[PDB]
Amino acid sequence: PVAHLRHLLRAHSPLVHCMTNDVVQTFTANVLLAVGASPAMVIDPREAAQFAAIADALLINVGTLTEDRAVAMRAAVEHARQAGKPWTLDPVAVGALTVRTAFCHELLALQPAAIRGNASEILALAGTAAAALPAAQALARRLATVVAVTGEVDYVTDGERVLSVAGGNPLMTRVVGTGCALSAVVAASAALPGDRLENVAAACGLMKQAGEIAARQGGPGSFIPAFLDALY
Amino acid sequence: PVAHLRHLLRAHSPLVHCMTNDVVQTFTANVLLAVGASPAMVIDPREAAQFAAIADALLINVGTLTEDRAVAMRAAVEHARQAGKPWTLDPVAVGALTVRTAFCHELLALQPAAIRGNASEILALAGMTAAAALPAAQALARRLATVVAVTGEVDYVTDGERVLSVAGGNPLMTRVVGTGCALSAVVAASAALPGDRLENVAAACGLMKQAGEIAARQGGPGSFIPAFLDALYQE
Amino acid sequence: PAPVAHLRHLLRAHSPLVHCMTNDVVQTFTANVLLAVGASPAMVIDPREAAQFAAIADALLINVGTLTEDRAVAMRAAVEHARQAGKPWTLDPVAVGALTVRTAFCHELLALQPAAIRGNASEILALAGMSATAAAALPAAQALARRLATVVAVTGEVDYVTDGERVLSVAGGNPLMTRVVGTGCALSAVVAASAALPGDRLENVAAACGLMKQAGEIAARQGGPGSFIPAFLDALYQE
Ligand SMILES: Cc1ncsc1CCO
Ligand SMILES: Cc1ncsc1CCO
Ligand SMILES: Cc1ncsc1CCO
């Protein structure tokens, strides 16, 4: 299942249009390259519209949102949707920051294939993980989307079924962008064949499995190269 | 006192609003996470004004300054000040590039809790090697009621009168981008912690040099980085 | 191989100050590579600051990997002030041919006389305006070099470098280099540095390609893309 997703990512080499935050660009691109996918960060509004039609999948991560970037993200989402390409939302700090929250609420109309966030963010988007489970189900139902609430245990739901994924290591939280990079791999996984819910759960399992390996060294510095090595 | 600062960073886990440059974002966030703090990069002018009142501390680093970002940074600083949250200035290349030099002069009016810079930067800001910039650092510290850290082979930290110096580190630290910029973020975090601000800032300097001495044992700047982050992390 | 070893010492000796206007994905790595080789990176992006600094720096890099309109303005100001001050500037036309805005922008920049251009086969073909790994674009390269009096480097598993008449080839490296982001973008930076060194420009740009291939070959035996990065920077630093 994780093994299957791994083989699939390599065989399809999904081309992922990443519109993500300033802190995680490099790490996201290297995670995607390590699993055999192709990252591409295109942020000018016109280029983004052009490219989102071409890419296999689109990721929207609002971690360092600005108004200019929001314009280009909205154009990207519209062109992806028009072209039948699945897009993934990562609502970083929604619920904590007003503008972000308003923007993501507006993007929900545009029918993401998947939403990947923490409990607080999922709870905010819907209006501890366990507490977010009802909200995630409701979101998945309203939008016919797959919702992943990530944490020490990840929970993935299509609004009917719910899958839990345990493993990994707390050290992953002391490394920036592991969640942001998980969303990119989830975004890629949505362009792959199979049950979407199950592919998103496998993506969570893939990242946890790499993380458990990488965490063995014991430190967050050495974690990064080992994490990337484990993905490849 | 380095051991004490490490303990404090872990126990207080300060939330640090980082408005820093494009070259050192990731490293800054990983450094803060490694010492037990929580980074947050928020750059829209509205969100930044919102967030700067919530975070425990604010870092302003002008290394890749742009017009939009300057507006956002000023707003963040104004709201941090109004909320009582300490903000730190890192005046990267102030004195060499005009726009950011003027901008930083403006910002000094809003009373940073700390300023962390190299000798030339501190001289340009004061209106006057690290030790050569020491009378300027002291003048700047007195004028603003701030702590000034003039950094280099040896770091000097002053509140206007008291001068603490911090030796250690390794020249390899200068062949890795962002070690100085990451120091500013740890200094920023430390200004939010209990205790004497001067001693905490000197302690932040000691912490980063000790980690750097350890990481430099790996021989090269590539291996330096993982080792440096490992050395900052406990357990 | 000799000019590569030579370049390695010249970069360290001159410590060229490179003004880097490059993409959001490769900032850190570009800076660290330039530091590892003994150069000095500087990322300056405000229009007024970039104009000021482009006059001062030893060389300028323009990489359009994550182009925006605001940034293209600053990049133009930089290029113009670098040219006025006689500092060599280098073009990395990332994804030219695949995205229209940056293709038009880079065509606009060609008029401003870059000292070097470095791209892959498809980018160089599209930049030259020719249809139909790197060998295939060598005609386009040559053509482009002549028209502009530039040095063009077309990279791939084998790199070709030309001033329009002469052609130098460099092989080696390792395909793992492609599973790590920014290795091309970083090569561009070192090329940009190399254009500011004394000697034959063409030969120096080729040697830059060689330097990076050699380090990549050593870095690649740490058989994963994660371990590659520290090993690559260490390799560039060693000696
Ligand atoms: C630290 C940080 N600030 C905005 S985004 C981000 C990375 C986590 O998504
Ligand atoms: C290399 C560089 N250029 C602007 S900022 C920065 C990071 C070093 O402080
Ligand atoms: C992944 C990516 N997207 C725009 S630029 C860039 C850098 C490739 O090296």
Ligand SMILES: [Mg+2]
């Ligand atoms: Mg999130």
Ligand SMILES: [Mg+2]
């Ligand atoms: Mg500084």
Ligand SMILES: [Mg+2]
């Ligand atoms: Mg290129």
